[PDB]
Design a protein around this ligand. Structure first.
Ligand SMILES: [Zn+2]
Ligand SMILES: [Zn+2]
Ligand SMILES: [Zn+2]
Ligand SMILES: [Zn+2]
Ligand SMILES: [Zn+2]
Ligand SMILES: [Zn+2]
Lengths: 141, 47, 138, 83, 54, 157, 171, 316
């Protein structure tokens, strides 16, 4: 429902926003009357400094491993709990398939581009109806 | 349209405006995310 | 009765019967509180008491200790007509014959009203009420 | 709760902080087109005009000195002995 | 107290025990971002309308 | 609602600016016009003091002479004067004093007597239906009598 | 209802208004803002009684900007609607959902569903009028409306009325 | 440079610190957040009802933040929530709750000893709340049996067990020896049976703090104005660590509800309950001693709120 902010100059109002963005001053200004359109400009490079949608999608997950000061009993109970919830999603085949495909590509000394193209192809096929089997070896080859 | 509300306490009249730094607002929102209430009052109830 | 007191709330004995059951004088039908309040609150309409069509008005209710609709109507009309006739030519001099004859006429009027006859004599009794009221005003 | 004039027991001398805020607020008002009570000798800077008004006690202000118990006093800058 | 060292523990104990702050401390007025009662701000400046007619 | 339970600022207990206790002042659409039209006169005297150094035509003309006094930002008060005047049947503060004498004689709430004096009714059922707070707090014959004396106090102006 | 209440307002003045006559300015502002405006807590403010004995109290200086703040206590005549309140009014605008009654400074709306069944909407007339079985509701016609609910928004108050019940409708 | 507002401008004076009640959390929040996914299925906009939906705050300037409208330079943010089907404990209160478990009966919910004891009479005269709770704890932690009749009193009598902290849990030891682990629902029930004089004698204020409120039931969800995500090159989008923690809380909560809906293996229910307790515990404080440390998929520990409020050069 709308939610689209469009910057316009109320003094000029003669054309769609043909503006200039001053990053050093942190403003955006109309290149005609010289009137600023917005102050306090946000950055995208600065938030990126601390840090894959193409393959993993929007799914999120976090690992549980052992801690600095912890017991080995709690590490097993948390991993066994995830082992019971691993059936909630059918994405175990993508990680194992990409693992074995990773082993074969690393065994063939092929570049990473062919690895990403092959993983993308297997992601395009995945589990469709026209495949109807092939025992996971033929779709990988 | 000059309209205000506060969810969960039935107010549409008595709304106060305060100027605080954005970092302090980050502190208050992190306390609310940590189940801590940083209630702010413009009047002195203790006197 | 314990099985009929509101067409929607006919059995509220196991729901803690804490609501009263009002009766409109133009319907003589039992309606519980939460229903009648919405009835006259949304507008003066008729109650669906077994397909009742007489309009239920706002307020003007009454508490009933239950003495049958016949006797309740006969005592309401009895008191109303008793107030319309008032004490005209009653204890004016001390006569017993004409007094008892006039009381017989009044009770016969109340009888014709509680029976209705054919909706013809009762209208003449209404004109008699207007005449008696005109005599009381003067 | 406003101590009366016969019970004001604070220092009658204007401190450097009171003189500072009086010259700052007065100069800020003069910068915002305030009625000047002293004839100018050709000044243009607002702070110099504020100090010119303080030198003749023509500043129309009164200080509300807060006491630690919650009370306060009203010492006008005209009756305060400067320097 | 929370500003100096152990922030989270002091805050948690505060919220747990329903503690109230007077908010005339130095760091408190700093955090909220308004004038503190120190020096110039330790007194309010008023106006006397009876002095304007002088 | 209309169950003698108004808001906080509209409660029966009010406090003036001096600190004393005062009952809620409820006005009907009779003296409410003479109070606005009244205070606007002394306001005109106050505007002409510092300057040194049939029933509808007079209403709108006086509303124009008072509109020149104000800064042209309160015409809803003048349209409210036309509303009240078009819905008012009372006149002169003496008769209004008599009306208050008839309303306070029953011992009712100020809002109730305001709704009594502000509405034109002929029978008691009209006053009991238009005013849900009054249905058993006062006798019907007394209300009919008040409507009779009021009917003798109203005059076509 | 037309009530009288003592209200208090904080007036802000620019440092350029600190002349000896500033009190007058105060009253001036105290009129220009209060008379005619509206509040969601006290209703539509009509007039302001007592113009000579207006208390000024003491003016305080807020930090930045140097503007002056005043707390004024006065007596004023205001108009506040109430829920379930029988009032009278005259129609201004007409709509298929109902005609908009004008009660003083408030424009009450009456929903078509809150009207009796005999009252029907007529658009073929100029202006469109609501014709019933005996009464014809037009713009210049006077109608007694029973207000059912009121909304108290800040500086804006609208109410909803009805005429379905008895002793209501056109006057 | 922000937009003008007609609200009265005042300074900030008194600041009150209190616990968040679950009812107030549900009254402040606007969304439920059920989908652990970040963005929508079409790889654009937002998930609408997920970890970062338009019902919360937004960044990127261009977006309007549905429920405030205006912009990101004006949006304070908006709060979501998470309604759990199993109550969990808060890290910073695990000790305090334990102390409460050593200050009140575990059945009738009444304070140990009574006002007839002289030491309790002396301890109640202290005006400081923390010292009162300390001394009263030192007295009540020794007596391990409620009593019905005390010579110059409530009933019960049931032997009060010994509460020990172990793996974010509280195990109760009965000598009678019968050792049983105290669940969160039982402790919360006993806390629901606490009288006013009891917790107010411990240092709680009814309008601000409650022992029932100390046990976490509903969880507030902070808006992206607190955890700003990034979309770099439109194909390298990074989400904050708290977002991943919320995804873990959602997966563990939905998993626990699914395991508790159909059947009951009794062991997978405890594994999923300890899993949700671990995700909430690491969400509040990841650097908890005696517990495993959650690590991100990049190779770095998960950044929690406590880490933002603890180390130097942080928020303070
Ligand atoms: Zn729409
Ligand atoms: Zn421009
Ligand atoms: Zn019923
Ligand atoms: Zn019926
Ligand atoms: Zn927002
Ligand atoms: Zn016990």
């Amino acid at each position: 429902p709308n939610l689209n902010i469009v910057l316009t100059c109320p003094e000029c109002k003669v054309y769609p926003p043909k503006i200039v963005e001053r990053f050093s001053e942190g403003d955006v200004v109309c290149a005609l009357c010289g009137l600023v359109l917005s102050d306090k400009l946000v950055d995208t490079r600065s938030e990126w400094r601390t840090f894959n949608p193409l393959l993993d999608g929007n799914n999120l997950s976090t690992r549980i491993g052992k801690g600095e000061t912890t017991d080995m009993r709690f590490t097993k109970e948390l991993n066994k709990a995830q082992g019971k919830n691993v059936m909630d999603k059918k994405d175990n085949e993508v990680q194992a398939a990409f693992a074995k495909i990773t082993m074969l590509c690393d065994a063939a000394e092929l570049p990473k581009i062919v690895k990403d193209c092959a993983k993308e192809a297997y992601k395009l096929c995945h589990d469709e109806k026209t495949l109807k089997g092939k025992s996971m070896e033929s779709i990988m080859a | 349209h000059n309209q205000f509300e506060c969810k969960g306490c039935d107010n549409k009249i008595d709304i106060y405006q305060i100027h605080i730094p954005y970092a302090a607002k980050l502190l208050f929102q992190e306390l609310m995310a940590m189940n801590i209430t940083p209630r702010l009052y413009t009047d002195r109830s203790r006197d | 009765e314990n099985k009929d007191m509101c067409p929607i709330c006919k059995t509220d004995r196991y729901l803690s019967p804490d609501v009263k059951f009002l009766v409109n004088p133009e319907c003589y039908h039992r309606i519980c509180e939460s229903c009648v309040d919405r009835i006259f609150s949304l507008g003066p309409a008729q109650c669906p008491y077994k397909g009742c069509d007489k309009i239920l008005r706002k307020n003007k209710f009454k508490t009933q200790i239950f003495d049958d609709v016949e006797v309740e109507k006969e005592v309401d009309i009895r008191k109303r007509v008793f107030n319309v006739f008032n004490k005209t030519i009653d204890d004016f001099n001390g006569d017993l014959v004409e007094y008892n004859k006039y009381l017989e006429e009044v009770e016969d009027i109340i009888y014709k009203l509680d029976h209705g006859i054919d909706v013809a004599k009762t209208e003449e009794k209404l004109r008699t009420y207007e005449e008696l009221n005109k005599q009381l005003i003067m | 709760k406003a101590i009366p004039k016969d019970q004001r027991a604070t220092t009658p001398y204007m401190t450097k902080y009171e003189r500072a805020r009086i010259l700052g607020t007065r100069a800020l008002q003069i910068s915002m087109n305030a009625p000047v009570f002293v004839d100018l000798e050709g000044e243009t800077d607002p702070l110099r005009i504020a100090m010119k008004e303080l030198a003749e006690k023509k500043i129309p202000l009164v200080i509300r000195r807060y006491l630690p118990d919650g009370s306060f006093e009203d010492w006008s800058v005209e009756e305060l002995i400067v320097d | 107290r929370c500003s100096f060292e152990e922030t989270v523990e002091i805050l948690f104990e505060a919220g747990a025990s329903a503690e109230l702050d007077d908010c005339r401390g130095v760091s408190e007025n700093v955090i909220l971002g308004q004038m503190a009662p120190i020096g110039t701000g330790a007194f309010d400046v008023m106006i006397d309308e009876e002095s304007l007619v002088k | 609602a209309a169950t003698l339970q108004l808001g906080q600022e509209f409660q029966l207990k009010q406090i003036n600016h001096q600190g004393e206790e005062e009952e809620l002042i409820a006005l009907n659409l009779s003296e409410a016009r003479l109070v606005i039209k009244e205070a606007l006169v002394e306001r005109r005297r106050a505007f002409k003091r510092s300057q040194k150094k049939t029933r509808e035509k007079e209403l709108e003309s006086i509303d124009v002479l008072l509109e020149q006094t104000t800064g042209g930002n309160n015409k809803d008060l003048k349209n409210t004067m036309q509303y009240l005047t078009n819905f008012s049947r009372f006149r002169d503060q003496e008769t209004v004093g008599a009306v208050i004498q008839l309303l306070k004689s029953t011992g009712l709430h100020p809002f109730e007597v305001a709704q009594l004096g502000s509405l034109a009714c002929d029978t008691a059922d009209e006053a009991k239906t238009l005013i849900p707070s009054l249905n058993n707090k006062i006798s019907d014959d007394e209300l009919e009598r008040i409507l009779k004396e009021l009917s003798n106090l109203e005059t076509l102006y | 209802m037309f009530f009288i209440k003592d209200l208090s307002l904080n007036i802000t003045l620019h440092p350029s208004f600190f002349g000896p006559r500033m009190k007058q300015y105060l009253k001036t502002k105290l009129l220009e803002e209060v008379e005619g405006s509206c509040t969601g807590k006290f209703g539509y403010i009509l007039c302001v009684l007592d113009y000579d004995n207006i208390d000024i109290q003491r003016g305080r200086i807020l930090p930045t900007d140097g503007s002056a703040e005043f707390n004024v206590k006065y007596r004023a005549v205001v108009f506040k609607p109430f829920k379930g309140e029988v009032v009278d009014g005259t129609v201004v605008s007409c709509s298929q959902h109902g005609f908009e009654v004008q009660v003083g400074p408030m424009k009450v709306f009456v929903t078509k569903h809150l009207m009796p069944q005999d009252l029907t909407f007529n658009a073929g007339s100029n202006p469109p009028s609501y014709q019933s079985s005996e009464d014809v509701i037009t713009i210049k016609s006077r109608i007694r409306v029973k207000i059912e609910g009121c909304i108290s928004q800040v500086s804006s108050i609208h109410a909803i009325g009805s005429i379905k019940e008895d002793y209501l409708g056109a006057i | 440079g922000q937009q003008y507002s007609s609200a009265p401008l005042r300074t900030v004076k008194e600041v009150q610190f209190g616990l968040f009640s679950p009812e107030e959390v549900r009254a402040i929040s606007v969304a439920k957040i059920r989908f652990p996914e970040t963005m929508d299925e079409t790889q654009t906009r937002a998930k609408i009802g997920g970890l970062n939906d338009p019902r919360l705050g937004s960044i990127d300037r261009n977006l309007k933040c549905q429920t405030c409208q205006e912009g990101m330079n004006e949006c304070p943010g908006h709060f979501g929530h998470i309604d759990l089907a199993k109550p969990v404990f808060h890290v910073g209160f695990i000790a305090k709750i334990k102390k409460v478990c050593e200050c009140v009966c575990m059945h009738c919910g009444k304070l140990l000893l009574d006002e007839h004891n002289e030491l309790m009479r002396q301890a109640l005269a202290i005006k400081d709340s923390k010292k009162r709770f300390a001394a009263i704890w030192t007295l009540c932690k020794t007596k391990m049996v409620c009593e019905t009749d005390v010579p110059s009193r409530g009933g019960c009598g049931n032997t009060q067990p010994t509460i020990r902290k172990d793996g974010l849990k509280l195990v109760g030891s009965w000598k009678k020896p019968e050792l049983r682990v105290l669940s969160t629902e039982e402790i919360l029930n006993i806390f629901k049976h606490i009288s006013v004089k009891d917790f107010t004698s411990l240092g709680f204020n009814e309008v601000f703090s409650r022992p029932e409120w100390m046990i976490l039931t509903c969880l507030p969800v902070p808006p992206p104005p607190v955890r700003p995500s990034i979309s770099f090159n439109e194909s390298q989008r990074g989400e904050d660590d708290l977002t991943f923690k919320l995804a873990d809380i959602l997966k563990a909560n939905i998993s626990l509800e699914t395991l508790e809906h159909n059947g009951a293996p009794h062991h997978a229910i405890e594994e999923a309950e300890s899993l949700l307790q671990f995700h909430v515990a690491t969400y509040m404080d990841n650097d908890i001693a005696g517990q495993p440390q959650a690590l991100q998929k990049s190779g770095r520990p998960v950044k929690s709120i406590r880490a933002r409020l603890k180390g130097k050069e942080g928020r303070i």
